[PDB]
């Protein structure tokens, strides 16, 4: 079974997961 | 039954103290016994 | 990658010293200086009976 959505949101809280921050930064950073 | 559920109950503020909120922002930052120097 | 012990023990070795705890470790180890006779081939052998 896969990770649930709210379960992975709690995972990002509890484990201190900054991979979303790194992906968001390196993806978006250059704009407009 | 609707009389018992339209009766007023007691009035505390304790759970409001448990779950209030706040919003503020922080703004930035001889003696009596000595005699005068001549 | 594997050639360093990762998890030092702070009561003896410490890569984040200050002056205060450096002097404290100096005075504690000078107080617990093992005497020079106590180094055999096996340092578990100072508690036994004497043969």
């Amino acid at each position: 079974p896969p990770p649930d959505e709210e379960e992975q949101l709690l995972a990002k809280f509890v484990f201190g997961d900054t991979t979303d921050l790194q992906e968001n930064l390196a993806k978006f950073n250059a704009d407009f | 039954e609707t009389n018992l559920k339209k009766l007023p109950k007691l009035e505390t503020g304790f759970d409001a103290l448990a779950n209030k909120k706040k919003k503020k922002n922080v703004l930035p930052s001889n003696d009596w016994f000595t005699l005068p120097k001549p | 990658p594997g050639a360093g012990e990762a998890n030092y023990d702070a009561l003896e070795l410490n890569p984040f010293e200050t002056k205060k705890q450096r002097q404290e470790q100096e005075v504690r180890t000078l107080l617990n200086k093992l005497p020079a006779d106590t180094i055999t081939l096996d340092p578990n052998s100072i508690g036994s009976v004497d043969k």
Partner: protein, 252 residues
């Protein structure tokens, strides 16, 4: 060569790390709002939450900051460390800080902007390592206590080395020392690269254009009777007169 030089290289390369408590308090008491005796007890969540309030006020007066509230002012950014990641990520976060600073260069008359940018001064150590974007992004407010605070916090990069007699001195630096800073052309090339990056991002505004114009006319006035220096100084001022004319605002 000199072992002292090869060690000062790694000293300036590892200034942004704390290896004992004295260096941690020396690297943490550098703050933009508070003084030493209060900023040396600030946990990161405190300045993060008041800076999130500051960013929200700045966002509801300026609509280009919700992207930063998503990315760089996030909740996990209080646990994101600077120098534990890889150099590609440090380059990406480097131009993220550059984008933030030249976006919020026009807002420094506001306590929300000050308390908002104090967070990444305190956490992302832009008072040490992303130093020159901070300096020549807030250079135009040189008669201001926020600039005196910036200059007292920061260490000076070698281009700005004629500001170094205004650290720990309560007089703000003068127009004449600003012109003596703009005089040498190897600062001037750097300032023009900043200026055309600001043009192509289209954030040019009527205060820093005024300051850049007054500094350029006084540099030309300083070299009024220096034919060689003017002959060397034409293809900088003229080239960015050109790529300033290629913009659209009447001010620039």
């Amino acid at each position: 060569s000199s072992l002292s030089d090869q060690l000062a290289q790694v000293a300036s390369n590892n200034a942004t790390v704390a290896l004992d408590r004295k260096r941690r308090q020396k690297l943490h008491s550098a703050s933009l709002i508070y003084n030493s005796k209060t900023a040396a007890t600030q946990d990161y969540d405190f300045i993060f939450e008041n800076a999130s309030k500051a960013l929200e006020e700045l966002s509801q007066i300026e609509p280009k900051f919700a992207i930063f509230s998503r990315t760089l002012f996030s909740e996990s950014s209080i646990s994101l460390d600077r120098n534990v990641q890889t150099k590609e990520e440090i380059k990406d976060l480097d131009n993220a800080i550059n984008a933030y600073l030249l976006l919020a260069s026009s807002k420094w008359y506001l306590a929300p902007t000050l308390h908002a940018t104090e967070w990444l001064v305190r956490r992302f150590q832009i008072h040490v390592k992303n130093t020159e974007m901070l300096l020549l992004s807030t250079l135009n407010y040189y008669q201001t206590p926020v600039f005196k605070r910036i200059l007292s916090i920061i260490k000076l990069p070698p281009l700005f080395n004629c500001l170094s007699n205004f650290v720990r001195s309560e007089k703000p630096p003068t127009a004449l020392t600003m012109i003596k800073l703009f005089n040498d052309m190897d600062f001037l090339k750097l300032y023009t690269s900043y200026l055309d990056q600001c043009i192509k991002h289209n954030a040019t505004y009527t205060n820093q254009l005024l300051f850049t114009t007054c500094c350029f006319i006084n540099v030309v006035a300083f070299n009024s009777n220096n034919d060689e220096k003017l002959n060397q100084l034409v293809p900088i001022l003229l080239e960015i007169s050109a790529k300033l004319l290629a913009s659209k605002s009447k001010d620039c």
